Structure formats: C-alpha cells, structure tokens
Amino acid sequence: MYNFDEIIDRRNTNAMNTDGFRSYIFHADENMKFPYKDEEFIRMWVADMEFATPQVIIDGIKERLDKRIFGYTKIFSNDYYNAFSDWCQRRYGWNFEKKHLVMSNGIIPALYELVQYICKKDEKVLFLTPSYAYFKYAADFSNRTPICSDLIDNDGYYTIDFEDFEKKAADEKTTLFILCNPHNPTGRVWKEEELKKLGKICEKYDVWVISDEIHCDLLRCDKQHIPLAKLFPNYKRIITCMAPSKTFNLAGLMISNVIIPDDNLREVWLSKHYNFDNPLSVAGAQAAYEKGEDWLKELQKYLDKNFEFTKEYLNKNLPKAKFKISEATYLAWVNLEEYFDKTENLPIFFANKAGVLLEGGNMFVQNSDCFIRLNLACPKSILEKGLKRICKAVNEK
Amino acid sequence: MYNFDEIIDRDEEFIRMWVADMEFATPQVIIDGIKERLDKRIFGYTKIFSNDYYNAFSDWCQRRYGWNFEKKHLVMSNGIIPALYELVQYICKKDEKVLFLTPSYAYFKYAADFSNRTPICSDLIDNDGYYTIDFEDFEKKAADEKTTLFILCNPHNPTGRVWKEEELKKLGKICEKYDVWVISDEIHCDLLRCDKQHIPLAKLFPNYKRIITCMAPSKTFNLAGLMISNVIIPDDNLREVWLSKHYNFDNPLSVAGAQAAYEKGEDWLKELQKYLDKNFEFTKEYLNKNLPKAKFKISEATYLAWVNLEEYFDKTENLPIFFANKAGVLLEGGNMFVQNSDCFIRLNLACPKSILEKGLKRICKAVNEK
Numbered sequence: 001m002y003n004f005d006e007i008i009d010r011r012n013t014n015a016m017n018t019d020g021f022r023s024y025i026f027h028a029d030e031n032m033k034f035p036y037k038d039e040e041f042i043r044m045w046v047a048d049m050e051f052a053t054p055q056v057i058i059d060g061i062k063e064r065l066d067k068r069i070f071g072y073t074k075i076f077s078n079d080y081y082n083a084f085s086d087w088c089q090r091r092y093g094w095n096f097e098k099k100h101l102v103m104s105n106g107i108i109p110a111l112y113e114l115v116q117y118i119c120k121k122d123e124k125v126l127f128l129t130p131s132y133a134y135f136k137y138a139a140d141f142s143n144r145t146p147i148c149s150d151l152i153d154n155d156g157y158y159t160i161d162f163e164d165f166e167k168k169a170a171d172e173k174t175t176l177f178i179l180c181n182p183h184n185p186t187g188r189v190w191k192e193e194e195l196k197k198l199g200k201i202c203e204k205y206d207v208w209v210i211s212d213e214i215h216c217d218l219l220r221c222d223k224q225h226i227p228l229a230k231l232f233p234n235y236k237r238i239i240t241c242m243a244p245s246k247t248f249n250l251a252g253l254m255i256s257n258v259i260i261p262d263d264n265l266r267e268v269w270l271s272k273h274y275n276f277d278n279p280l281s282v283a284g285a286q287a288a289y290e291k292g293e294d295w296l297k298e299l300q301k302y303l304d305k306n307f308e309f310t311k312e313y314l315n316k317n318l319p320k321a322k323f324k325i326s327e328a329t330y331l332a333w334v335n336l337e338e339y340f341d342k343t344e345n346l347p348i349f350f351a352n353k354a355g356v357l358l359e360g361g362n363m364f365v366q367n368s369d370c371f372i373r374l375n376l377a378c379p380k381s382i383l384e385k386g387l388k389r390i391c392k393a394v395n396e397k
Numbered sequence: 398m399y400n401f402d403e404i405i406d407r408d409e410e411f412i413r414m415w416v417a418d419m420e421f422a423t424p425q426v427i428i429d430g431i432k433e434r435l436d437k438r439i440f441g442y443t444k445i446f447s448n449d450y451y452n453a454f455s456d457w458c459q460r461r462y463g464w465n466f467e468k469k470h471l472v473m474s475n476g477i478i479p480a481l482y483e484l485v486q487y488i489c490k491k492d493e494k495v496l497f498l499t500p501s502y503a504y505f506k507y508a509a510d511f512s513n514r515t516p517i518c519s520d521l522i523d524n525d526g527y528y529t530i531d532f533e534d535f536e537k538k539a540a541d542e543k544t545t546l547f548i549l550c551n552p553h554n555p556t557g558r559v560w561k562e563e564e565l566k567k568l569g570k571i572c573e574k575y576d577v578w579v580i581s582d583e584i585h586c587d588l589l590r591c592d593k594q595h596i597p598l599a600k601l602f603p604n605y606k607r608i609i610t611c612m613a614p615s616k617t618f619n620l621a622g623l624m625i626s627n628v629i630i631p632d633d634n635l636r637e638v639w640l641s642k643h644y645n646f647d648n649p650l651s652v653a654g655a656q657a658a659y660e661k662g663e664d665w666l667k668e669l670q671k672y673l674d675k676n677f678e679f680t681k682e683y684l685n686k687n688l689p690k691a692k693f694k695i696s697e698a699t700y701l702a703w704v705n706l707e708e709y710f711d712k713t714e715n716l717p718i719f720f721a722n723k724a725g726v727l728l729e730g731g732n733m734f735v736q737n738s739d740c741f742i743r744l745n746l747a748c749p750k751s752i753l754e755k756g757l758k759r760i761c762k763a764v765n766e767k
C-alpha cells in the first residue's frame with residue numbers, strides 16, 4: 001500500500017547527498033565545475049535513501065511535537081527498550097539486558113570513542129577489506145593503527161581469509177576487531193559458521209569486537225541476520241551497534257543503539273558522555289521499531305526487484321561487468337576490472353562522463369580496485385536513468 | 398497575544414522549580430518550522446549548508462544587541478555544557494586553572510574537574526541583594542600564570558545580574574592583560590527584564606581573538622532537548638581544533654527549530670518577557686507580604702528568582718530537602734551553586750501565575766510553621 005516509485009524532492013533540505021558531494025567525494029571546493037547542473041546528476045553515492053520515511057515514523061515525531069515542550073530529556077520509561085528489544089526478539093531471536101544499552105549520536109562517533117576506550121595508543125584496529133572507510137578513520141582519528149584482512153573475491157562471492165585473519169588477530173597489539181555484519185560494501189550476510197569462527201578467534205586472543213550491524217534489516221528477502229552477540233552471548237568483549245537510521249532513512253536524527261555488556265567499558269562510556277537525548281529523535285526511533293516493520297517488508301521487496309533489475313540491465317548492457325546481487329544493504333557492488341585500471345578514478349569519470357555521482361576505488365580502503373558502489377534506494381525510474389548513463393559512458397570509452 | 402496561563406501537562410503532586418526549563422509551551426512558530434521540515438519526508442545526512450541559519454541568528458544578534466560575528470567563526474554544539482567540557486581541554490593544559498564567579502552554575506566547576514583542570518572561584522559581593530564583582534580579587538586570580546580560562550556567565554546565573562558595560566570592560570581588559578581566554582556563556586541573554594539590554598562581551602572586545610561566545614535558543618524557547626547551540630570562536634587555531642574533534646553532522650529537525658526561533662520567535666519572546674516581569678513583580682509582593690524576613694531582589698535576567706533566607710535557616714540546614722518534605726516544592730538551593738550561596742533557594746518563575754502562587758504559598762507556609 002506504498003508508493004516506492006514516488007520521486008521525492010530533496011533540493012533545499014540541507015542534505016549532504018545533494019549539497020556536498022564536491023567535498024565528500026572529491027575533497028574539492030564548492031566552485032568545482034561539472035558538465036552537468038547539480039540537479040542534472042543521478043546521485044547514487046552516500047548511503048541514505050530517496051524513499052520517504054514511513055508516515056508512521058513521521059506521525060510519531062509529530063505526536064511528540066504536540067506535547068509542545070522540548071526541554072531536557074533522558075529515556076526514562078521502558079517504552080523505548082521494550083520496542084527495540086521486541087524488534088530484536090522477533091526478527092533475529094536475540095535479546096540483551098536493558099542496562100547494556102547506551103545511546104550515541106551515530107555509530108561513527110561511537111566507533112571513534114570506543115577505539116579510544118578499548119585500544120591503548122600503540123594498539124591496532126583490525127577489520128575486513130574492502131570496507132566503509134570510517135573503520136580506518138576511527139583508528140587514525142586517535143593515532144591507533146588500522147590493519148586490514150583482505151576478503152577473498154570468489155567471482156563476487158566474498159569469503160574470509162581466516163588464516164590471514166587469525167594471524168593478524170593473534171598479534172598482541174591487535175586489540176579491536178571492527179566487524180561489519182552485514183558487510184559494507186560487499187553485502188555479505190555472514191553465515192553462522194563464519195561468525196562462530198570469527199568470534200572463537202577473537203575469544204582465543206581476547207580481542208574486543210565492535211559489531212557494526214547497521215545494515216542488518218536491509219537484507220534480501222531470503223536472508224536471516226545473526227547478531228554476533230547471539231552466537232557469543234557470554235563474551236563480555238562484544239559491542240553491538242544498531243540503528244533505525246539506514247533502515248528508515250533517519251541518519252539526520254543522529255540516534256543509535258550501542259549495546260555494551262562489559263561493565264567496565266560501559267562505565268567508561270557513561271562517564272564520558274553527555275547522556276541527554278533528543279526527544280524528537282527518540283520519538284522517531286521508537287516509532288520505527290514499534291510500527292515500521294510493515295513498511296520495511298515492502299521496502300525489502302522493492303529493493304530486491306531493483307537488485308534483480310540491476311543485474312539484468314548490467315548483464316545485457318555491460319556484459320564484461322562482474323556483479324553478484326548483494327545479500328544485504330541497498331548498495332550495488334560492480335567490478336569494472338575489464339574496463340578500467342586500478343589508477344583510473346571512477347567517481348571523477350562517471351561524474352564528468354555519465355552525470356552519475358557514485359563511489360568506488362580506494363573509497364573502501366583497499367581490496368576494491370576498479371569497483372564502483374551504487375546506491376539503489378531510489379525509485380526504479382531514477383535507477384534506470386542511472387544505469388543507462390553508466391553503461392553508455394563506459395561503452396563509449 | 399499568547400496564553401501563558403495555559404497549564405500544560407502536570408514523585409507525586411510536586412510543584413516543580415527544578416532545573417532551568419520552562420513550563421510554558423514552545424512558540425507555535427518554531428513547532429510549525431519543525432513540522433515543515435517533517436513534511437520534506439526524508440531525514441538523511443545533514444549539514445548546515447544554506448546561509449539561512451546564519452542570517453537568522455546573525456540578524457538576531459544584530460538587531461537585539463548591535464553585535465555581529467563572522468559566519469566562519471560559528472560552530473555548532475550539542476549544548477553549552479558539552480562545549481564547556483571540551484573547550485576546557487582545548488584551552489587549558491592539565492595543571493592550569495579555570496576561573497569563574499561564584500555563586501555559579503555548578504557545571505562551571507564540573508567542566509574543570511572533568512578533565513582534571515583546577516576550578517577557582519571569585520566570590521561576588523552581595524550588597525543587599527545586588528551583586529558586584531570583587532575586581533581586585535578577580536585580577537589577583539586572573540594574573541596567576543597558571544590561570545588560563547575565565548568562564549563568564551553573561552547574564553549571570555544564579556544572581557541574574559545583567560553586567561553593565563563598565564563591568565564587562567574591566568573584566569575584559571583584565572583578561573586581555575594576562576592573555577586569559579574567556580568563554581562567554583550567554584545562554585540567558587534574551588531572558589532579561591523588559592528594561593535591560595544585553596551586551597555580548599565580544600561586542601566590546603571585537604579584536605580579542607581569545608573570547609568564545611556561546612548562545613542557544615534552548616532556554617529562551619524551551620528547546621534544550623533539541624541539543625543545538627552556537628559557539629563563536631574567533632581564534633582560528635582553537636576553531637580548527639574544535640572542528641577536527643567534532644562529528645560535524647546536524648539534526649535537521651533541530652536546525653529547523655532553531656532557525657524558526659531566530660526567524661519568527663521574537664514577538665512571542667517579547668510577550669514572554671512581559672509575563673515573566675509580572676511573575677517577578679508578584680513574587681516580590683508575595684514574599685514581602687508572607688515571608689517578610691526573606692531577602693529578595695528581582696533578578697535582572699533569567700526566569701529564576703534568587704531568595705536569601707539567611708534569617709530563617711542555618712548554613713547547615715538542607716533547604717532542598719526541607720522544601721521537598723515540608724512544602725512539597727522541588728527547588729534548588731544551598732551549595733548547589735559551587736559556593737557563596739548559603740541559605741539561598743532558587744525559584745523557577747517560568748510557569749503560569751496560578752502555579753507560581755501555589756508554589757509560593759507552600760514555601761511560605763512551610764517556613765513560617767518552622
């Protein structure tokens with residue numbers, strides 16, 4: 001009963017997706033001229049959606065707006081916990097103690113703070129590559145050392161090099177593993193056996209794990225999500241991070257769940273944080289977990305068709321492009337090995353030659369030569385324009 | 398015209414004069430501004446890209462104080478308390494001292510203790526309810542080479558002093574003499590009595606790059622929950638440090654609300670000031686009539702009354718606990734303001750006059766029956 005084909009204007013909303021691609025993609029100043037008006041770009045880069053936030057969420061916020069006062073706010077009642085807990089209960093069969101829950105502005109700030117709470121200045125921060133570049137930046141931020149275990153590209157199906165991973169985890173300075181569960185940008189939904197071996201390895205060398213599960217509700221319709229903490233429920237050194245922000249297009253609300261079993265780490269967190277909450281943000285998030293499931297299940301259906309359409313479009317019109325439909329996220333990961341070199345800048349190319357803004361190459365640290373990443377969380381009509389522009393521009397090269 | 402008499406919503410039957418937020422509703426102009434952003438239907442990654450918010454806040458400062466600041470000196474914060482905690486670390490080395498005037502907001506002290514800097518206090522001078530600065534005591538403590546940061550509360554909380562131009566000049570010159578950084582906490586600068594002008598410290602010292610001015614729509618419009626405040630950092634070094642240590646994304650609903658506050662909120666604010674003035678006037682008459690040994694000067698700013706009860710209690714009697722148990726009023730008082738506040742209670746008058754009358758009656762009855 002929803003119209004995901006509806007085009008939604010985003011001009012003049014202080015959205016980075018429309019207003020700041022020069023800085024975040026190209027580290028260039030706002031003067032930078034393009035062959036295309038800003039409005040003329042198909043924008044498929046930063047991971048927020050072109051779909052509208054469900055009206056149940058918007059109404060939940062308006063309901064809080066009608067209480068008419070927006071003073072100092074902490075989550076006093078158990079409403080928020082119960083809703084988020086029941087959401088985890090019925091979608092993954094996982095639960096957590098309420099007192100293990102703390103709130104953060106977003107998982108990125110959570111990562112930057114947790115790195116300093118967990119790692120001594122000379123310790124290392126391990127993660128699987130290619131990845132979301134902020135796993136590196138979180139470690140660079142406070143002069144910790146990012147280390148990478150390259151995944152294994154079996155024709156688009158990625159697996160973990162467990163021997164390389166155990167070797168790097170075993171290092172005594174390697175103290176923190178940042179896991180992306182499900183993985184960004186490959187889309188891997190980690191199977192139970194994969195997570196067991198990852199967790200057992202971290203238990204062997206007593207390595208702390210931050211599990212970034214921010215994409216865990218954007219799976220393909222035939223996939224289950226397993227929180228790592230579900231398999232390792234007594235390991236005090238796992239931190240679980242979840243947020244309604246990806247699922248429901250709520251990044252602006254800057255609210256996310258950080259589950260910290262370790263009593264010492266959690267006490268550290270609490271003593272370092274301004275522990276007030278935004279009432280409109282709590283109202284939106286609480287609405288998302290209470291009422292947002294029906295919209296999410298239709299969104300999952302629409303994302304699947306977009307993925308299936310994207311494979312057919314590429315098989316037909318970019319046949320030397322290698323592309324496996326991602327098991328999770330709304331992000332398409334396309335290998336253009338056969339068309340480009342490691343050293344050709346794919347974002348700059350597609351901006352100037354296709355009028356499409358995308359991410360690729362070393363925006364995902366390493367292990368991503370000649371890859372582009374496409375945001376498909378937009379109406380099928382806008383996506384089709386994007387794909388036509390991409391294939392046309394690559395062929396003409 | 399606005400209905401400040403409206404009761405909004407209602408631990409049992411407590412009259413609450415706890416924490417500095419209002420019982421009045423946020424103006425409908427701000428709420429409509431948020432709902433308008435709600436209707437854009439998407440809430441993705443957000444930075445303050447357009448110049449609208451700057452223009453609104455810039456013009457607000459322009460036409461209400463005759464002060465302006467460069468757009469590039471403006472950075473955003475979750476609140477002035479977090480700003481205080483971080484700015485202490487960017488400015489003061491451990492082993493350096495953080496000076497402020499007492500009594501004060503206790504978070505001036507905690508901001509220093511937080512990162513193991515040292516809090517030091519210059520007591521204000523109480524001449525029959527009118528507070529003044531002991532300028533020689535202040536220069537003595539500022540002159541200390543380890544004393545690096547002065548946190549000024551302008552207007553002052555909890556006395557309510559609206560600092561006159563000469564007072565700010567002498568404070569500013571003293572800090573210029575010893576190169577002491579000043580954080581000017583000006584969060585109450587629009588909650589003044591109708592016959593008071595606010596002077597930002599930086600207006601008088603527009604070339605001293607070491608003043609940071611802090612302002613927010615939060616107290617003025619009941620918006621602390623939106624966690625948005627303006628921090629103006631002339632010093633390019635401090636500002637770059639600030640910028641490199643912060644997650645520089647904003648809540649679009651928060652930006653929409655603060656923007657609406659500065660664009661359209663002035664008329665409600667001038668109506669609020671009239672209503673606060675009458676509440677302050679009633680409070681004096683009420684206490685003069687029913688607690689005649691209580692010493693009380695109408696505060697020049699904030700919606701908080703500062704009442705001296707020297708004559709009914711000892712320094713050792715816990716006033717918050719007394720009024721909790723004996724009057725059913727939750728209030729702040731005593732040593733909740735670092736020091737220089739024995740036997741004081743602070744009353745929130747930012748509520749309908751009928752609720753204030755009930756609260757005052759309970760307070761007077763409990764003290765008189767003591």
Ligand SMILES: C=CCSC[C@H](N)C(=O)O
Nearest residue numbers: 024025045046047048132
């Ligand atoms: C240019 C800066 C980050 S863009 C990455 C995007 N937010 C994602 O999560 O895929």
Ligand SMILES: C[As](C)(=O)[O-]
Nearest residue numbers: 106107108243245
């Ligand atoms: C929850 As987030 C703002 O780090 O996408």
